[PDB]
Amino acid sequence: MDPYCPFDALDVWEHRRFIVADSRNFITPEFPRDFWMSPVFNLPRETAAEQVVVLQAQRTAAAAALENAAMQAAELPVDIERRLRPIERNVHEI
Amino acid sequence: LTQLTLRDAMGTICHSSLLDVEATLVALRQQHLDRQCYFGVYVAEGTEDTLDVQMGRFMETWADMMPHHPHWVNEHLTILQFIAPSNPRLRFELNPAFDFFVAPGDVDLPGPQRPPEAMPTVNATLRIINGNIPVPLCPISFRDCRG
């Protein structure tokens, strides 16, 4: 698991003034690596398909209530013509 | 002689430049923040599980122990250890009202459970607190006192 590197180590001392050819070192933490713990990404069990099932069941349940309300409100036009026509005839009797 | 007992600081610190986050932290951007990581700050949303082997997968990734637990959970000595540090409580301690943790990814708090390693931004959130005020120099006469 060691990355390949031909060269071991080299040395020409670090005078703060004489910095030339500005490269950048690999910045590392001071803590032992063992707690830089492992990669884990876990799925939500509710799947893109499962939410489809749940929301479709909800849509189909709501459609029944919408149809119930429509059929409750679809009888009012029958009520108007069932209630007012006899009243119009009674007025006509005069 | 003359009185000065009990009346005024209310034209006064309802004040604006304390919530303060643009330019101060700004003026000290660019380093590398001293030895400090999570203790824990990220967040999440459920766990698609049910309460007991809760036991089993939440402490056994709290499995293998670091090498010095370092800068927030002290609790027992007397006073002027506020005053010569063996011990940390001051570079996460200088004034509370802006006081500005290390801080991984604002974490898109909250989601699921399992781990990467730590990047923050810069800072804001208001410890509106000032009265066990930050701290480490104290005794028990002056607030079993306020009682």
From Swiss-Prot, chain A:
Compartment(s) of residence: Virion; Host nucleus
Disulfide bonds: none
Domain of life: Viruses
Stretches the record annotates as Interaction with major capsid protein/MCP: 1-49, 1-50
Family classification: Belongs to the herpesviridae CVC2 protein family.
Function of the protein: Capsid vertex-specific component that plays a role during viral DNA encapsidation, assuring correct genome cleavage and presumably stabilizing capsids that contain full-length viral genomes. Participates in the interaction between the capsid and the tegument through interaction with the large tegument protein/LTP. May mediate the capsid docking to the nuclear pore allowing entry of the viral genome into the host nucleus through binding to host nucleoporins NUP214.
Record text on subunit structure and interactions: Heterodimerizes with CVC1. Interacts with major capsid protein/MCP and triplex capsid protein 1/TRX1 at the pentamer vertices. Interacts with the large tegument protein/LTP. Interacts with host NUP214; this interaction might be essential to the capsid docking to the host nuclear pore. Interacts with host TMEM250.
Protein name: Capsid vertex component 2
Source organism (scientific name): Human herpesvirus 1 (strain 17)
Curated annotation (Swiss-Prot), chain B:
Transmembrane segments: none
Location within or outside the cell: Virion; Host nucleus
Domain of life per record: Viruses
Subunit structure comment from the entry: Homomultimer. Makes the hexons and eleven out of twelve pentons. Interacts with triplex proteins 1/TRX1 and 2/TRX2; adjacent capsomers are linked together in groups of three by triplexes, heterotrimeric complexes composed of one molecule of TRX1 and two molecules of TRX2. Interacts with scaffold protein; this interaction allows efficient MCP transport to the host nucleus. Interacts with capsid vertex component 2/CVC2. Interacts with the small capsomere-interacting protein/SCP.
Family per similarity comment: Belongs to the herpesviridae major capsid protein family.
Function description: Self-assembles to form an icosahedral capsid with a T=16 symmetry, about 200 nm in diameter, and consisting of 150 hexons and 12 pentons (total of 162 capsomers). Hexons form the edges and faces of the capsid and are each composed of six MCP molecules. In contrast, one penton is found at each of the 12 vertices. Eleven of the pentons are MCP pentamers, while the last vertex is occupied by the portal complex.
Protein name according to UniProt: Major capsid protein
Full-sequence range covered: 466 to 612 of 1396
